[PDB]
Design a protein around this ligand. Structure first.
Ligand SMILES: *[C@H](C)[C@H]1/C(=C/c2[nH]c(/C=C3N=C(/C=C4\NC(=O)C(CC)=C4C)C(C)=C\3CCC(=O)O)c(CCC(=O)O)c2C)NC(=O)[C@@H]1C
Ligand SMILES: *[C@H](C)[C@H]1/C(=C/c2[nH]c(/C=C3N=C(/C=C4\NC(=O)C(CC)=C4C)C(C)=C\3CCC(=O)O)c(CCC(=O)O)c2C)NC(=O)[C@@H]1C
Ligand SMILES: CCC1=C(C)/C(=C/C2=NC(=C\c3[nH]c(/C=C4\NC(=O)[C@H](C)[C@H]4CC)c(C)c3CCC(=O)O)/C(CCC(=O)O)=C2C)NC1=O
Ligand SMILES: CCC1=C(C)/C(=C/C2=NC(=C\c3[nH]c(/C=C4\NC(=O)[C@H](C)[C@H]4CC)c(C)c3CCC(=O)O)/C(CCC(=O)O)=C2C)NC1=O
Ligand SMILES: CCC1=C(C)/C(=C/C2=NC(=C\c3[nH]c(/C=C4\NC(=O)[C@H](C)[C@H]4CC)c(C)c3CCC(=O)O)/C(CCC(=O)O)=C2C)NC1=O
Ligand SMILES: CCC1=C(C)/C(=C/C2=NC(=C\c3[nH]c(/C=C4\NC(=O)[C@H](C)[C@H]4CC)c(C)c3CCC(=O)O)/C(CCC(=O)O)=C2C)NC1=O
Ligand SMILES: CCC1=C(C)/C(=C/C2=NC(=C\c3[nH]c(/C=C4\NC(=O)[C@H](C)[C@H]4CC)c(C)c3CCC(=O)O)/C(CCC(=O)O)=C2C)NC1=O
Ligand SMILES: CCC1=C(C)/C(=C/C2=NC(=C\c3[nH]c(/C=C4\NC(=O)[C@H](C)[C@H]4CC)c(C)c3CCC(=O)O)/C(CCC(=O)O)=C2C)NC1=O
Ligand SMILES: CCC1=C(C)/C(=C/C2=NC(=C\c3[nH]c(/C=C4\NC(=O)[C@H](C)[C@H]4CC)c(C)c3CCC(=O)O)/C(CCC(=O)O)=C2C)NC1=O
Ligand SMILES: CCC1=C(C)/C(=C/C2=NC(=C\c3[nH]c(/C=C4\NC(=O)[C@H](C)[C@H]4CC)c(C)c3CCC(=O)O)/C(CCC(=O)O)=C2C)NC1=O
Lengths: 162, 159, 172, 249, 162, 162, 173, 173, 162
């Protein structure tokens, strides 16, 4: 699965050669940034419960019909709202997973793989989840270069949504 | 020949004449042979242009003389590009049947242009005559009459 | 790929005799009962996408760890994997009702499916709990009294459900 | 031995995704698969359509068909990817295509038949033409079917086919088994009188018809010589200063 | 493109054989079906203008927020409502096209090919168009076997939507 | 094996899609004619014993040397004439098989597959069997559209012979 | 591409973006009656398909006899069998054209790149269209048959059939 | 072929066969120094990659409105998804060019044979480069804009970021 | 050709996706490493003429027969010694080339590609060139982390020799 340490391996393995200095250099790059990436993981893990209920009530604001229309898919009764905090709470897990891995791999393999297939069948509009993630990237309270770090992977999930 | 017939019947108040419709029918019937002539001239672009330009420099050494305009590699390359342009317009006129593509792309204001460029008109005309002779030698005989008569329009209109 | 028309040829070739008159009276009922079969297939394929998710509202709600972290339907391509081939059951069951014989069903859903389902690690028995939930919705749609002239489709209803039971037996 | 020179790939149809399965037309080929057996009609169709790509339909004949490799395919002992190697590395195919065509055109004709794509540019045909020469033809056919563009797109058990020719001519039809430069050697344009009429007025016959002498015979030699002369000197003649230009002693 | 007369050809062409009686039989079937299919084409063409504005105001009922939310995709101002009757009016064209062709070919090639790509980018939820097509299949006023005929292709567009 | 119901399946299976209305239409066509095809099966089954000995003595007329020349390949003694009514009697079986199947499949799989291989080895000239089948198509006594239907498959075996 | 009579009157009607007019549906209604006659007619071509090709090959080679004589491009035995396979592929796609009712499936296979290979190989291209005309002389002789078919005017249909051979001869010659 | 700023100043230096001069290494030292900015520019483009394409498609089709109207080559739905499946491939390789820092990886994929297919298919070639310019107007607006970032002159990167779009528009038009 | 910036491209190009944060990390690594790699380039370029004649007279020490045996291949007369400083002087060029590129690419493409083919034909024993490169890696006078930097690529040419 996609990781800068893995991407050095799978490039050098398909050539059948050893680890050159060019694969070695890629590994070194992760460390400079991995020191600031683990700063972004603790910023999201400590503020996790504020961010989930901060998000799942922000999507109810912009889409008020989602709490009103009676459908299995919509979040009309409590069972949808129970599956609301599950789904949005699944996003902050994988975002924090792809932070400490350094690559988009866990985001690529757990979340966005086959997302167009599932949202068409269950009629979950992807405009809902992109509205929650814009709330997360503006309200995580992170600063410095770590604020850039979470901001890529959130925005990477945004582009894969649309 | 359709554009010219339409604008000629446009100047009058009437439709297209039976004579003109016979002209369009005969032009359609000869159009496939004209596409064959265009095929041969497209595929013989290089050697026709080079033989015509070198025939021009055999006839007229004033242009490649150091007082002349086409002195140097770049200037003579632009000379051969001008001959390429005129051969391209000749192929357009052979296909269309009109000389309005030849005219409104390369004839209508060429005297004032080559006056301001310092280039002699008659040497352009002699080069297009060399193109006429070369393409006449390449093609079939009355097919070469067809190609060389459009070449003849270009030669007479340049001077 | 065999049929009702072609399988009664293929055993008749193996014995090497001409087709008897009571086999042709059997096939004459197949042509007579033929129009009903087309109608049944049409209603299934028009409600084909509506069946699969409505089976997926119960295939995952009844065994809820499958979706939950750890189960084999957990991540999103894994979830789209059991909708990619929940419909392939319907893609070949509808081929079986069209042909009228399950010999085209047993080469695709029944042949090597029980082998991959222990090679991958997926629960094989957790498929046939929901293919039964497809059959409960397929014969409900098929038996509808609306928009169709009344006729007896009992043979189709019971041996339409026999194709789902063959589709559940070779997976479980 | 030596790695491939890097060649530029031109933009063609098949480098593009073409999303979806339920959306493509009817005219995409039937993607015959040995895993789908169910009958012998599917078994005979898989053999016949695998001959279709390799021999362009007309040849399959009776004699060309290798009956033992088809004997094997029904059994399932050898994969279809192994089965195309038996047809391609077969001297019934060598006399038909490989001897007859050129190392530069063989790269073009075997990519359309085994990989189902035309070569991008001439540089791709130039690139593999070396791999033909040192490894042999069967060494190169081995390198095409081992290649990762084959296994990703077709796989181990799927007969080849033209990928994504939405608006293109079929590859067995647009390309013969031998081109025009070789046409006199395998064909019979020498003995047919229909072509010698075309040839009679051809510009190549006029170079042959001329007697010994004329510089038009050496006109092809004059284009290959090159070496054009320098122009006259820019410096004006008048300054020259001819009176002081002479050197004493 | 997909047609029962075409499907007889492309099956027999890839085998390299002539037209057998099996290829021919499919064509024969179309004429009896095609006599009742052209009945369904005139039923939709004559009632075309009632059905479009019957549909594009039915989708505004179930989704009232689509006329209220200001967005390029949303039909808030008149521009969206102008593109409303264009899009829903495009559907009744292709449904009537696939009626007289007998196959799903024109529906497969003009409408549903690459529909998941376009609805993700422009954020057009496919739950909108399926609500209009349910209004069409219930309000075309067609009867008999022709009422079955339009009802397949409408429902075939429904399943390709979701 | 080749059948209009099968040909609808194998076309739709290789695309990986459901049964559209274009595969459905083909199935109906097979069923409708199939009413006149089973008329042709009873016409050949009831007149089976008249047609076999009507045929195997018609081929002896046009080829009188086949009963005279001593060779196993030839029908000189009684063992060839015993294998005469076997072989020609095999033809009316497969013709009646391909009648009720609606396609040329049983004719394609039982009779004509590899027929050029067998007739070259045993030196059985295919001009013999085509002379028997011309006797069958003219002397079956069938009438109407069933007469037309019976003939196609006889004439399809004729073209595969030569 | 594969087009029809049914689908081509859709495809231009899509390009103008209007509903199908009533006189186009009266045009297609004429076609349904015609179709039954065509199926009976097209079955006669395919049942006499192998009998046409050799009977055309009794004249394609007898009229230009150097072709099979030593030197011609139909001389050796796989070269002779090469021609027969191709000769029937003309009949394989002309019968597809009469079935579809429009020559748009004919022009992708026999008319598209055929005139290019026939100067690349060295075969006489004009010596094909002398015998495809000899196929048409035998094809419309069989289709226009008074035996075993209830008399119905098939002249309107026949004209379409004859032309497909003329399109098949024009793009080779 | 895939070249760089680091590798192209090797490749001409190999062709002359000399050691690398000290002022070439002072040139590359500025490339490493200006290197950090390059990474940032790519990051903002790829994070707003999907937002650029539709916002260019809100003007590529609104300015030439026959293209999606019946008859145009962006009319039907697969066709429409065809000029979003490769509107982004322009962005897929322009971002590769800014990463490598040299347009030699751009000219093998978007500039090599693209002008040949665009007259073979029938698509308007000039109607692409009206909207690739509309991508460049939105790409340098995002890359240039600074939010919560240290401010430094990005003119060298931006002027020659826009040079890659102008090369991407020249070989299509 | 092989470069950590190139290896990020060719990995992301074969997937058909954009530049993720994982492709970017390899590029990021090069700048910190590349600051110390250009230190190693000036250390070899300034001491270039001392290192070549320091090497080509060190190989004459361990292999004294190479200046004595008369053959075209050996360096007996002045023409071999003229081709001595050419060949060893070619090595320090490509080592300095692969320093500033950061990868082994220029070393992989100019020097070691097909080196087993050429040394077998001209009978140049590869034990000669590995003896010169051990003299270079011990006598370049480089210090610090830059001393590690030249020491990889010299040793990478050693392993490709044997
Ligand atoms: C026949 C009257 C003349 C003739 C035929 C002939 N052709 C070939 C070789 C080829 N024929 C084709 C033709 C087609 N390919 C297509 O895809 C289609 C449409 C579906 C057609 C009609 C092609 C591609 C070839 C090239 C080789 C191939 O078979 O795949 C031969 C063999 C010639 C040779 O092998 O060199 C022959 C004999 N030639 C004649 O002599 C007759 C005048
Ligand atoms: C250029 C068009 C715009 C711009 C850029 C800009 N960047 C910086 C500083 C930094 N940029 C980065 C980026 C990265 N470092 C990494 O390791 C990676 C992963 C490969 C990235 C994406 C960093 C980290 C720095 C410096 C260190 C830090 O931020 O922690 C500056 C100012 C600082 C500098 O010169 O480096 C600028 C200006 N700014 C604009 O306004 C332009 C439009
Ligand atoms: C680990 C990462 C991960 C996530 C996030 C995930 C989400 C996910 N949510 C689903 C359904 C759902 N998702 C929601 C959530 C919502 N719908 C609404 O109305 C609200 C707007 C919104 C929440 C804010 C609801 C209510 C369902 C049930 C819909 C149905 O049953 O049709 C489904 C399909 C059925 C299921 O198994 O429950 C998946 C796969 N799956 C994953 O593997
Ligand atoms: C399609 C119609 C068309 C024509 C005819 C045309 C001519 C043309 N000739 C030019 C120059 C030139 N043209 C010539 C021409 C000649 N040398 C001679 O002595 C001969 C008489 C003549 C050869 C026929 C020379 C020598 C120059 C270079 C002059 C300069 O650079 O100042 C230039 C300026 C440089 C350039 O853009 O190439 C133009 C535009 N352009 C057009 O678009
Ligand atoms: C709810 C239980 C039930 C079913 C299932 C049912 C079906 C049904 N379909 C019928 C007819 C039919 N059904 C079809 C259907 C089709 N033909 C085709 O070729 C198309 C592909 C396909 C539509 C897509 C046709 C063509 C007929 C002809 C008779 C009629 O118009 O009803 C009839 C007429 C009466 C009869 O057949 O005895 C019945 C009974 N009736 C019932 O009471
Ligand atoms: C990596 C380099 C590369 C490119 C660019 C490429 C393009 C490409 N564009 C295609 C089609 C197409 N391309 C378009 C594009 C457009 N329509 C418009 O109105 C716009 C002006 C324009 C896009 C901005 C359309 C409509 C089609 C489908 C045309 C048809 O099917 O008739 C096709 C045929 C179908 C397919 O996608 O496989 C290819 C191969 N292939 C390549 O390998
Ligand atoms: C021939 C078959 C066919 C259809 C149907 C089709 C639809 C289609 N509708 C579109 C946009 C649109 N579609 C709509 C329609 C709607 N949005 C709403 O708010 C309403 C809920 C709904 C109508 C009931 C609107 C308003 C736009 C413009 C949205 C935008 O510009 O972002 C677009 C993208 C931009 C365009 O070219 O105009 C396509 C491709 N394209 C096709 O080729
Ligand atoms: C189920 C379809 C089917 C058919 C029809 C069939 C025919 C068939 N007929 C054969 C021989 C034969 N076939 C014939 C028939 C004839 N020879 C004559 O002289 C007459 C002209 C003509 C009959 C009208 C005879 C006499 C033999 C024996 C020849 C021998 O033993 O050499 C043989 C080889 C030996 C055998 O097993 O008996 C086969 C395979 N096999 C099949 O599987
Ligand atoms: C696909 C399998 C199939 C075939 C082959 C078929 C043919 C077919 N041709 C028919 C009629 C007919 N077919 C013809 C054809 C002709 N008469 C002439 O004298 C002309 C020379 C020739 C046309 C060139 C005629 C005249 C009729 C009269 C009845 C009608 O108009 O259909 C009919 C009407 C119903 C019947 O005969 O029972 C059938 C069945 N039907 C099928 O289902
Ligand atoms: C750009 C990278 C590059 C290198 C380095 C290279 C070396 C190289 N050195 C060669 C020969 C040679 N190499 C040497 C060098 C040596 N022999 C000795 O005796 C000494 C031990 C040693 C030097 C220290 C000599 C003397 C020859 C000539 C041998 C002969 O002619 O047989 C040859 C074969 C003939 C030639 O063209 O001159 C090659 C290809 N080629 C390349 O393309």
């Amino acid at each position: 699965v996609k990781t800068p340490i893995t991407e050095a391996i799978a490039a050098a393995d398909t050539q059948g050669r050893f680890l050159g200095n060019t694969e070695l250099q890629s590994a070194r790059g992760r460390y400079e940034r991995a020191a600031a990436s683990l700063e972004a993981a603790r910023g999201l893990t400590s503020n996790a419960q504020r961010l989930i209920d901060g998000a799942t009530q922000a999507v109810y604001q912009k889409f008020p019909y989602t709490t009103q229309t009676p459908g299995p898919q919509f979040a009309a009764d409590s069972r949808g709202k129970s599956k609301c905090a599950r789904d949005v709470g699944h996003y902050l897990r994988i975002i924090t997973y792809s932070l400490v891995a350094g690559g988009t791999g866990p985001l690529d393999e757990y979340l966005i793989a086959g997302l167009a297939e599932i949202n068409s069948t269950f009629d979950l509009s992807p405009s809902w989840y992109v509205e929650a993630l814009k709330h997360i990237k503006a309200n995580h309270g992170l600063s410095g270069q770590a604020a850039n770090e979470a901001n890529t992977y959130i925005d990477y999930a945004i582009n894969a949504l649309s | 020949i359709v554009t010219k017939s339409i604008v000629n019947a446009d100047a009058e108040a009437r439709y297209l004449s039976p004579g003109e419709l016979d002209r369009i029918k005969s032009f359609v019937a000869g159009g496939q042979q004209r596409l064959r002539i265009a095929q041969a001239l497209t595929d013989n672009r290089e050697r026709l242009v080079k033989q015509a330009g070198d025939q021009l420099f055999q006839k007229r050494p004033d242009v490649v003389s150091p007082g002349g305009n086409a002195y140097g590699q770049e200037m003579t390359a632009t000379c051969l590009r001008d001959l390429d342009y005129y051969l391209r317009l000749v192929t357009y006129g052979i296909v269309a049947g009109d000389v309005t593509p030849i005219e409104e792309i390369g004839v209508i204001g060429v005297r004032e242009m080559y006056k301001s460029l310092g280039t002699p008109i008659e040497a352009v005309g002699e080069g297009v005559r060399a193109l006429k002779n070369a393409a006449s030698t390449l093609l079939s005989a009355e097919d070469a009459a067809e190609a060389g008569s459009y070449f003849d329009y270009v030669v007479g209109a340049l001077q | 790929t065999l049929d009702v028309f072609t399988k009664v040829v293929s055993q008749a070739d193996s014995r090497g005799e001409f087709l008897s008159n009571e086999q042709l009276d059997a096939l004459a009922n197949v042509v007579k009962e033929g129009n009903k079969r087309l109608d049944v297939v049409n209603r299934i394929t028009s409600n084909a996408s509506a069946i699969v998710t409505n089976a997926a509202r119960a295939l995952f709600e009844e065994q809820p760890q499958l979706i939950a972290p750890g189960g084999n339907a957990y991540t999103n391509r894994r979830m789209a994997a059991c909708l990619r081939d929940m419909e392939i059951i319907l893609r070949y069951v509808t081929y079986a009702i069209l042909a009228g014989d399950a010999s085209v069903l047993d080469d695709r859903c029944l042949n090597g499916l029980r082998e991959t389902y222990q090679a991958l690690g997926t629960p094989g028995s957790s498929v046939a709990v929901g293919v039964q939930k497809m059959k409960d919705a397929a014969v409900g749609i098929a038996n509808d009294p609306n928009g169709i002239t009344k006729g007896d489709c009992s043979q189709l209803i019971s041996e339409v459900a026999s194709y789902f039971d063959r589709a559940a037996a070779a997976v479980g | 031995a030596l790695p491939l020179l890097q060649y530029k790939p031109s933009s063609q149809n098949h480098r593009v995704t073409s999303f979806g399965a339920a959306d493509q037309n009817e005219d995409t080929p039937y993607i015959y698969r040995i895993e789908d057996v169910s009958s012998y009609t599917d078994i005979q169709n898989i053999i016949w359509a695998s001959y279709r790509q390799v021999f362009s339909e007309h040849e399959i004949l009776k004699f060309n068909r290798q009956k033992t490799l088809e004997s094997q395919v029904k059994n399932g002992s050898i994969s279809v990817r192994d089965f195309i190697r038996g047809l391609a590395k077969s001297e019934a195919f060598y006399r038909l295509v490989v001897s007859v065509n050129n190392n530069y055109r063989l790269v073009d004709i075997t990519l359309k038949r085994l990989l189902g794509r035309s070569s991008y540019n001439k540089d791709e045909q130039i690139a593999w033409s070396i791999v033909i020469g040192t490894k042999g033809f069967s060494g190169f056919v081995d390198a095409l079917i081992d290649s990762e563009e084959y296994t990703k797109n077709f796989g181990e058990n799927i007969v080849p086919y033209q990928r994504k020719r939405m608006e293109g001519r079929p590859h067995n039809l647009v390309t013969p088994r031998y081109g025009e430069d070789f046409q006199e050697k395998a064909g019979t344009v020498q003995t047919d009188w229909r072509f010698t009429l075309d040839k009679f007025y051809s510009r190549k016959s006029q170079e042959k018809q001329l007697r010994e002498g004329d510089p038009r015979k050496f006109a092809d030699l004059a284009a290959s010589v090159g070496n054009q002369g320098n122009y006259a000197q820019r410096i004006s003649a008048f300054d020259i200063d001819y009176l002081n230009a002479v050197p004493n002693r």
